[PDB]
Amino acid sequence: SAFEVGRNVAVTEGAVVFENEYFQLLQYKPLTDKVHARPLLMVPPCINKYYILDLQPESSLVRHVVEQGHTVFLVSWRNPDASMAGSTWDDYIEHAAIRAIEVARDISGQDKINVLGFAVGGTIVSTALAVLAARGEHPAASVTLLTTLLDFADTGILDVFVDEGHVQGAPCALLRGLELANTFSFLRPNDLVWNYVVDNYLKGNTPVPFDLLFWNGDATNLPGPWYCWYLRHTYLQNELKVPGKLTVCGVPVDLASIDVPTYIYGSREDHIVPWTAAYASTALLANKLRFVLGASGHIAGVINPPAKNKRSHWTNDALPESPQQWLAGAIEHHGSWWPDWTAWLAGQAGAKRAAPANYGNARYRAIEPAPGRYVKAKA
Amino acid sequence: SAFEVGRNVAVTEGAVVFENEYFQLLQYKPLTDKVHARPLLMVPPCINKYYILDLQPESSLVRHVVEQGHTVFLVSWRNPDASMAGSTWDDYIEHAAIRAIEVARDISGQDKINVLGFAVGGTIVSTALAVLAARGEHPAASVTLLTTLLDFADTGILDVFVDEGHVQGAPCALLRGLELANTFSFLRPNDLVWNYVVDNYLKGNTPVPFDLLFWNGDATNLPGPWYCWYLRHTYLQNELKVPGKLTVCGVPVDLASIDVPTYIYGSREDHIVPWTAAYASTALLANKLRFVLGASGHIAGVINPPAKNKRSHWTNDALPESPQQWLAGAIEHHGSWWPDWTAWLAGQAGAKRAAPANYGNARYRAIEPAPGRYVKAKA
Amino acid sequence: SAFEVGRNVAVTEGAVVFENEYFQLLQYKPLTDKVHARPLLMVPPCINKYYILDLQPESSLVRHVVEQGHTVFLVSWRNPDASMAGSTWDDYIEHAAIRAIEVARDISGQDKINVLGFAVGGTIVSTALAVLAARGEHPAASVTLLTTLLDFADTGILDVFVDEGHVQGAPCALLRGLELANTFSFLRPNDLVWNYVVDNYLKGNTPVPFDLLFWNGDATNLPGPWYCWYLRHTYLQNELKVPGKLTVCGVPVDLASIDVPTYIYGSREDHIVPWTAAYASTALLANKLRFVLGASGHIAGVINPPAKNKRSHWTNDALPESPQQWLAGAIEHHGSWWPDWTAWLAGQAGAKRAAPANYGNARYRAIEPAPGRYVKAKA
Amino acid sequence: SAFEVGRNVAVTEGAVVFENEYFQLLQYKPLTDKVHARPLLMVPPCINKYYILDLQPESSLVRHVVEQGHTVFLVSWRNPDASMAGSTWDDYIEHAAIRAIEVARDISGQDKINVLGFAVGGTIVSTALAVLAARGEHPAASVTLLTTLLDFADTGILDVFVDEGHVQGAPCALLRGLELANTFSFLRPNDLVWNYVVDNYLKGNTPVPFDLLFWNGDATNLPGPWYCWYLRHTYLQNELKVPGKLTVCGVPVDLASIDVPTYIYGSREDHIVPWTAAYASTALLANKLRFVLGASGHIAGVINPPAKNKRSHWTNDALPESPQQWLAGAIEHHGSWWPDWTAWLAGQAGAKRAAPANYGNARYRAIEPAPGRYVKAKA
């Protein structure tokens, strides 16, 4: 049977508890009698859709975390239409990332929550917490950055231009539009012919899994100004990592101001987010950092549920400046890195108490079942 | 003054002597009293337009070759519109590459002509001569391949997919359409935001020259089936280099059947056509081969006129299997590789005779002045 | 307890059945009631000693193969002294590799034997079989090449010399001597200070295993002319892979003349024998080839016994010219590649018969117990 | 005529003005009527000998600087014998680098001198100035680092060990000895066979120049403890770049404490000192930095005298963290970088005054002519 969101993918039980123009907040039904006091808010990429994190039941990171006894909230992004063709990077920071933190924290009744980002979700959520810290607000107990670029050095975009030249910016706000985006071709063509040829080639000549291809093919639109800002200030000019260089939502962005315990994950054969580029976050972030390297590629490495006991991962408590030095002292362990992370997350999440009986609270009651209608909208 | 094709770029004097739906054949006015008996037919890429080879007068390869005493013909590709949305790779081989060889050879009155390809023009013209050889036809005295991919190994398209998968084609003729193409982003996004951000970034933060950016920004459309075939059978499946694997215009393609003296050029810092990938052509082609490596990038290396006496180039008469072995024995020479090539081309071009007084011949008289109206058509 | 050859490493039960100036032939005691008709002759490197293949009982490749029901013979190289300071590459081919094939085949009473090489042992044994084929002799049923260089392209020795030069051999037989050699620093310094600093660094700051370091530290001498020939004609001039280019023991060496079923193994993170360099053997060898890629480094990848169920390996029955194309279509399987190989080897080894009661035969009776005295000799 | 130090190489006119067990201080004869008030002290590598900087007259950096009107002093290292087999890194810092600064400064009568280092000479002289700064001493007006490693990340020594290990220091002062060293094989074998095969191969099959090979073949001894310390604390543990991590001559080493205008040079195709590794010095050093990239290899790039007008070099006044960003904004200029540097050096060297009539001063009179007897001593 073909893949269908809400039928055989993204089926972990939950409810939409909040929605605005930019996103729906999902809250998942408890699967345990007790849960940690502090919930986990997941911020997935808005390049493709969130359900790479809740793919099928056996492979779902959401379901796994719920079964370890955490309350999980998740940002399901709107797939923007013409009405959002002028949305900016700042709009997304304020009205989705910061808003989601506020609503999840309100529902939880806790002073602090745990947060997670994946891929550009990690870049987004890190920017949001840096904005909040400059406002004097510290709503996060800890941060998990899965496969996240903060330092974009050596991602390859300028390679073909370095040796042109003789031997001797225009504001993003001026753009409007919706640009198709996907993960595996985010720095590659996105057109009918490329998509046709690449998809057909991979399905017949490689073991790339079909549910990955379905997720990647379920494309999302990026608003013009948002895509412009992201391309300009990260991949091209690499300014987010320069403390105070960028102003976002009225304040300078200094990633060191986040200043909470942070778990930083990358995959060794990942060529979308090089693992050395993820590791470069250890030079930027304050407080107690942990870096963990999973084996294999961009998705295969992150989505490696422990039950199957496949692959491996490396740990090293020392954090030298150079990633090769880190790997030289690292120990390889059999199987999934997920138990390493969930044990770390448990230490950040407070004591276990009786699970909630209902979704949301008086202010934010259930709207409709997870996965929600936003994730079903086509580009 | 802004760049304008036919006013301050692509201004070498000439005439259109033939045209069909796919291209116009240009013939340039002699600048010398005598010319070699055999003319040179240039086949430029149809990704962007031909005039990278006739950019400004100081930098024009066309003008330089005409001033060395060769009759030059050149393929100026149609910029396809809706009527050509179904054109195929075979259509282009038969009705443009092979057709241009036939018309140029007819006008010249010679039994054989010299041919040149640049970038995908070199792939196109090599395929055409292999098709012709299988028909028992040998219209070329020699072939010059500038910055040409024939073996597409290690061009990078499959990199992000190699480590996806668990631990354990649809015909191009079905597509229609016109897809925007340019050279520096042929394997990169082509959309309004990318083009805006990249162009603005390069102009303000790099010495990439403005006439290069103008040429690259002067985009061309690729017909759906053509783009599908090119992507599938070269970059993805790398089959052109497998003798007899591909059937084109009714015959198997064996690049070894071209079998004429061949000059093979690449640029050392070229990351669009890696110089080692150009060098791999030496393993495929029969007859007497010469490989020459120019310093610098994709365009800077090829467009290096000798008058300025800039950069350098390497030569080595030995042709080991490995490019690093070639470079280890190579000698570096000061300045442009153009004199090396034109001296080689003179040896293929026959004796010098009085230059022609008029364009074309009785069958093919002048239609309109170079650069012709096809090259002025926008995508 | 410290490592000691014959006490807690290299302890698989066996006997020396033959010896000359160059090597001792070991034959291991059967561990099964029946064995395949055709035995396996292992040719280990003479850079360091053989017992990387019989390290500790849990990690021993020899013991594993004996327990799968093969008679195993093995070349234990002399550690040369002053009397051998003039030994040549040809001497080793004739008086050790070819001699070992002859003696093992004689003892077995079989028309053909299976052979295995590891690292330079694979280069040696491939050269020997190519020499034998040119003599009209085909003593091998199949060949297993573990981590073997035949095509030495891109091994890195010329890298630092490629860009020296202005902008514009002495016979190996003349050398005498013994040069210290080890595996991990074969292309690196071998001196008291390097060995002291590197060993101390690895033991205190990495998980490199101590038995690996013991084996690597148990250095062997290379005769001057042998080391000269190996360096010159493989790493530097890469001529073994050129059919007929080199003359060895009176005949031209054409590796395609070996022409038997061949199993070719490499390890993905191996930077001593790059896996792509091992893969390049598929372009040289005739008959039915299988290529298998193990995960991890030079030794960790090869020495991965299946009982522990660690790591992974890739298979692909297609053999494209390019290794990246091979990997793109490859399937990753959990755990050790050893079962893949032993199942392949069983298909080459004939039917199972009662195991031999005694070592050797009338001509070659047991001399002394394995591991033999040659392997205990210090450099 | 064969190369001979003091006859046709290292012939710039000068005198030894000081000597101790570790080195001779050379002072060159003026070639101009006036010289800058501040002299330049050159600290060459002690791996091979100094005269790579005074090779032949046309190629001599020393002669070129003297002809631009600077007084040049130079450290000519002792080639250590058995009496120095216990010399340490600290011994060399105190009794050669710091001593040479003191003597050159005394002879000059100036409060500050300019200093230059090349290769390990740059590492040595940077350490010495950092030691002096911690003592409250600032004898340098400016520093020139040619092809110098300070940050040794990614130099490749740990590559072969990173993927060994299961799935789960001894003081340098204890060594004695003299270890042969050269530049192009400093991380490669140094033995009779390697040297024989490599030298013979390069001379017959590459354009590597013979005077380079002569210099490289003129090997120097490294004392055991010195070589141990250098290997351990730079290439292996990369600690010099960690402020205060290493204690040298009784004080912590913080390279930021040097704090003088600094010219940092690297060569683009240099694989002994990667240009990106040289560039990494810009992250360590205080005060006004300039980085300049020369084209070509380790020696070809540095030794590029301007008279011949060969090669090119890049400049960029911006200093981003990433070297690729630096190169993307860099402008390529024709020919040698030497005029760029000497113009920079003139700005550091004070006003021009009448040249000295005699070598040295009352305390330090001429001992013997340059090049001196130390440089003639064989290993």
**All structural domains of chain D with their residue ranges:** 1-379
Q: What is the DSSP letter of D335?
A: S
Count Cα atoms within 13 angstroms, Cβ side, for A307.
8
The answer to whether the CB atoms of B168 and C325 lie below 8 A apart is no
D324 touches B: beta carbon within 8 Å = no
With CA atoms as reference, report the closest residue to A348 among A42, A68, A112. A112
Centroid of chain to Cα C322: 24
Mention every residue, 6+ apart, whose C-beta is less than 8 A from residue D28. Answer: D12, D13, D14, D62, D63, D66, D71, D72, D73, D74, D370
**CA C45/CA C51 separation, integer angstroms:** 10
B1 touches D: beta carbon within 8 Å = no
With CA atoms as reference, report the closest residue to D73 among D116, D111, D20. D116
Q: What is the DSSP letter of C270?
A: -
Smallest CA–CA separation between C274 and chain D, in Å? 11
List CB contacts (< 8 A) between A232 and chain B.
Answer: 197, 201
Say if residue B57 is preceded by a cis peptide, omega within 30 of 0: no
Contact A77, A44 (CB under 8 A): yes
Instruction: Report the alpha-carbon angle B130-B132-B135, nearest 5.
Output: 115
Integer angstrom CA distances of residue B122 from B44, B45, B266: 7, 8, 12
- Secondary structure of residue C374 in the 3-state scheme: helix
**CA A171/CA A225 separation, integer angstroms:** 9
**CA A184/CA A213 separation, integer angstroms:** 9
**CA D110/CA D97 separation, integer angstroms:** 18
Contacts with B, A 210-269, CB within 8 Å? 212, 222, 224, 227-228, 231-232, 236-237, 269
Other beta carbons less than 10 A from residue D107's beta carbon? 23
With CA atoms as reference, report the closest residue to A310 among A300, A299, A323. A300
Q: What is the DSSP string of C27-87?
A: EEPP-SSEEESS-EEEE--SSS-GGGGG-SGGG-HHHHHHHTT--EEEEEE----GGGTT-
Q: Which two tokens stand for residue A377?
A: 């909208």
With CA atoms as reference, report the closest residue to A166 among D312, C340, B255. D312
Against chain C, the chains showing at least 3 CB pairs within 8 Å are A, B, D
The answer to whether the CB atoms of B206 and D334 lie below 8 A apart is no
- Report the relative pairing of strands A262-267 and A140-146 from DSSP bridges: parallel
A164 touches D: beta carbon within 8 Å = no
**CA B79/CA B7 separation, integer angstroms:** 19
Contact A48, A220 (CB under 8 A): yes
With CA atoms as reference, report the closest residue to C70 among C34, C116, C36, C28. C36
- For chain A, what is the HEC assignment? CCCCECCCECCCCEEEEEECCCEEEEEECCCCCEEECCCEEEECCCCCCHHHHHCCHHHCHHHHHHHCCCCEEEEEECCCCHHHCCCCHHHHHHHHHHHHHHHHHHHHCCCCEEEEEECHHHHHHHHHHHHHHHCCCCCEEEEEEECCCCCCCCCCCCHHHCCCCCECCCCHHHCCCEEEECCCCCCCCCCHHHHHHHHHHHHHHCCCCHHHHHHHHCCEEEEHHHHHHHHHHHHHCCCCCCCCCCEECCEECCHHHCCCCEEEEEECCCCCCCHHHHHHHHHCCCCCEEEEEECCCHHHHHCCCHHHCCCEEEECCCCCCCHHHHHHHCEEEECCCHHHHHHHHHHHCCCEEECCCCCCCCCCCCCEECCCCHHHCCC
Largest CA distance in chain B: 72
The answer to whether the CB atoms of B201 and A227 lie below 8 A apart is no
The answer to whether the CB atoms of B163 and A269 lie below 8 A apart is yes
Contact D52, D44 (CB under 8 A): yes
Q: In sequence order, what are the beta bridge partners of D291?
A: D264
How far the first Cα of chain C sits from its last, in Å, is 23
Q: Which two tokens stand for residue C271?
A: 């930077």
Contact B116, B144 (CB under 8 A): yes
Rg (CA), chain A: 20
With CA atoms as reference, report the closest residue to D49 among D8, D80, D82, D73. D80
Smallest CA–CA separation between A244 and chain D, in Å? 15
Size of chain B in residues:
379
Method by which this entry was solved: X-ray
Q: In sequence order, what are the beta bridge partners of A167?
A: D332
Burial class (CB in 10 A: 0-12, 13-18, 19+), B94: middle
Q: What is the DSSP string of D226-261?
A: HHHHHIIIIIIT--TTSTT-SEETTEE--GGGS-S-
With CA atoms as reference, report the closest residue to B299 among B271, B333, B340, B263. B271
Contact A90, A233 (CB under 8 A): no
D271 touches C: beta carbon within 8 Å = yes
Instruction: Report the alpha-carbon angle C70-C71-C77, nearest 5.
Output: 120
C173 touches D: beta carbon within 8 Å = no
Burial class (CB in 10 A: 0-12, 13-18, 19+), B288: exposed
**CA D367/CA C47 separation, integer angstroms:** 51
**CA C125/CA B119 separation, integer angstroms:** 45
Burial class (CB in 10 A: 0-12, 13-18, 19+), D177: middle
With CA atoms as reference, report the closest residue to A141 among A344, A361, A354, A357. A344
Q: In sequence order, what are the beta bridge partners of C75?
A: C25
**CA C88/CA D239 separation, integer angstroms:** 44
List CB contacts (< 8 A) between D165 and chain A.
Answer: 331-332
Helix H or strand E encompassing C115: strand C113-118
Q: What is the DSSP letter of D343?
A: H
Contact A283, A321 (CB under 8 A): yes
Centroid of chain to Cα C63: 16
Mention every residue, 6+ apart, whose C-beta is less than 8 A from residue A299. Answer: A52, A212, B164
Q: What is the DSSP string of D143-192?
A: EEEES--SS-TT-STTGGGTT-S-B----GGG---EEEE-STTTTS--SH
Count Cα atoms within 13 angstroms, Cβ side, for D305.
18
Smallest CA–CA separation between B315 and chain A, in Å? 21
Mention every residue, 6+ apart, whose C-beta is less than 8 A from residue A192. Answer: B175, B177, B179, B224
**CA C50/CA D324 separation, integer angstroms:** 46
Amino acid identity at B24 = Q
Count Cα atoms within 13 angstroms, Cβ side, for C145.
33
Instruction: Report the alpha-carbon angle A61-A65-A70, nearest 5.
Output: 150
**CA C124/CA C117 separation, integer angstroms:** 8
For A332, list phi and psi in degrees, rounded to 5. Answer: -90, 130
Contact A273, A281 (CB under 8 A): no
Smallest CA–CA separation between B235 and chain A, in Å? 11
Centroid of chain to Cα B325: 27
Q: What is the DSSP letter of C365?
A: -
Mention every residue, 6+ apart, whose C-beta is less than 8 A from residue C239. Answer: C233, C245, C246
Resolution of the experimentally solved model in angstroms:
1.8
The answer to whether the CB atoms of A160 and B184 lie below 8 A apart is yes
Burial class (CB in 10 A: 0-12, 13-18, 19+), C26: buried
Q: Is D372 left (phi over 0), alpha (psi -120 to 50) or beta?
A: left
- Selected for mutation to probe chain B from A191, A195, A212, A308 (highest B CB count within 10 Å) is A191
**CA A326/CA A275 separation, integer angstroms:** 12
**CA D192/CA D320 separation, integer angstroms:** 45
List CB contacts (< 8 A) between C331 and chain B.
Answer: 165, 168
Other beta carbons less than 10 A from residue A364's beta carbon? 18
Q: Which two tokens stand for residue D373?
A: 């007897």
The answer to whether the CB atoms of A207 and C332 lie below 8 A apart is yes
The answer to whether the CB atoms of D177 and C164 lie below 8 A apart is no
- Report the relative pairing of strands C220-223 and C178-181 from DSSP bridges: antiparallel
Helix H or strand E encompassing D107: helix D99-108
Which residue in chain D has the smallest CA separation from B324? D206
- Facing B194 at nearest CB: one of A158, A159, A231: A231
Other beta carbons less than 10 A from residue A353's beta carbon? 10
Which residue in chain A has the smallest CA separation from B268? A163
Say if residue C30 is preceded by a cis peptide, omega within 30 of 0: no
With CA atoms as reference, report the closest residue to D80 among D176, D227, D178. D178
**CA A340/CA A9 separation, integer angstroms:** 26
Other beta carbons less than 10 A from residue B244's beta carbon? 13
**CA B235/CA B118 separation, integer angstroms:** 17
The dihedral of CA B347, B353, B355, B357: what is its sign?
A: negative
Amino acid identity at A3 = F
Smallest CA–CA separation between C270 and chain A, in Å? 14
**CA C107/CA C365 separation, integer angstroms:** 10
With CA atoms as reference, report the closest residue to C344 among C104, C121, C43, C36. C36
**CA B115/CA B72 separation, integer angstroms:** 10
Contact D55, D299 (CB under 8 A): no
Q: Which two tokens stand for residue C172?
A: 């190996």
Burial class (CB in 10 A: 0-12, 13-18, 19+), B327: buried
Mention every residue, 6+ apart, whose C-beta is less than 8 A from residue B126. Answer: B117, B143, B145, B148, B150, B255, B258
Contact D343, D321 (CB under 8 A): no
Mention every residue, 6+ apart, whose C-beta is less than 8 A from residue B242. Answer: none
List CB contacts (< 8 A) between A193 and chain B.
Answer: 175, 177, 179, 222, 224, 227-228, 231
CB pairs under 8 A between A and B: 168
Instruction: Report the alpha-carbon angle D98-D100-D104, nearest 5.
Output: 125
Other beta carbons less than 10 A from residue D250's beta carbon? 10
**CA D220/CA C59 separation, integer angstroms:** 44
What is the four-CA torsion angle of B150, B155, B160, B164, rounded to 10 degrees?
40
Give the position of tokens 């800039």: B310
Say if residue D371 is preceded by a cis peptide, omega within 30 of 0: yes
Contacts with C, A 303-322, CB within 8 Å? 310-312
With CA atoms as reference, report the closest residue to B273 among B246, B245, B293. B293
Integer angstrom CA distances of residue D136 from C116, D130, D132, D325: 66, 10, 6, 36
C153 touches B: beta carbon within 8 Å = yes
Give the position of tokens 């010098």: B352
**CA D22/CA B315 separation, integer angstroms:** 45
List CB contacts (< 8 A) between B205 and chain D.
Answer: 328-329
Smallest CA–CA separation between D243 and chain B, in Å? 33
Which residue in chain C has the smallest CA separation from A328? C206
The answer to whether the CB atoms of A192 and B163 lie below 8 A apart is no
With CA atoms as reference, report the closest residue to D152 among D180, D179, D184, D187. D187
**CA C269/CA C273 separation, integer angstroms:** 9
- For chain B, what is the HEC assignment? CCCCECCCECCCCEEEEEECCCEEEEEECCCCCEEECCCEEEECCCCCCHHHHHCCHHHCHHHHHHHCCCCEEEEEECCCCHHHCCCCHHHHHHHHHHHHHHHHHHHHCCCCEEEEEECHHHHHHHHHHHHHHHCCCCCEEEEEEECCCCCCCCCCCCHHHCCCCCECCCCHHHCCCEEEECCCCCCCCCCHHHHHHHHHHHHHHCCCCHHHHHHHHCCEEEEHHHHHHHHHHHHHCCCCCCCCCCEECCEECCHHHCCCCEEEEEECCCCCCCHHHHHHHHHCCCCCEEEEEECCCHHHHHCCCHHHCCCEEEECCCCCCCHHHHHHHCEEEECCCHHHHHHHHHHHCCCEEECCCCCCCCCCCCCEECCCCHHHCCC
- Facing D205 at nearest CB: one of B207, B312, B329: B329
D328 touches B: beta carbon within 8 Å = yes
With CA atoms as reference, report the closest residue to B306 among B63, B71, B118, B115. B63
Contact D243, D255 (CB under 8 A): yes
- Secondary structure of residue D32 in the 3-state scheme: coil
Mention every residue, 6+ apart, whose C-beta is less than 8 A from residue B347. Answer: none
Q: What is the DSSP string of D45-72?
A: -SSS-GGGGG-SGGG-HHHHHHHTT--E
Give the position of tokens 């911020």: A43
Give the position of tokens 């100026």: B76
Smallest CA–CA separation between A171 and chain B, in Å? 9
**CA B352/CA B355 separation, integer angstroms:** 9
Which residue in chain D has the smallest CA separation from C200? D169
**CA B49/CA B222 separation, integer angstroms:** 12
- Secondary structure of residue C301 in the 3-state scheme: helix
With CA atoms as reference, report the closest residue to D50 among D183, D166, D224. D183
List CB contacts (< 8 A) between B154 and chain C.
Answer: 322, 324
- Facing B331 at nearest CB: one of D207, D311, D330: D207
Helix H or strand E encompassing D204: helix D192-205
With CA atoms as reference, report the closest residue to B26 among B53, B59, B8, B48. B53
List CB contacts (< 8 A) between C334 and chain A.
Answer: 310
**CA D337/CA A142 separation, integer angstroms:** 51
Q: Which two tokens stand for residue A286?
A: 């304050």
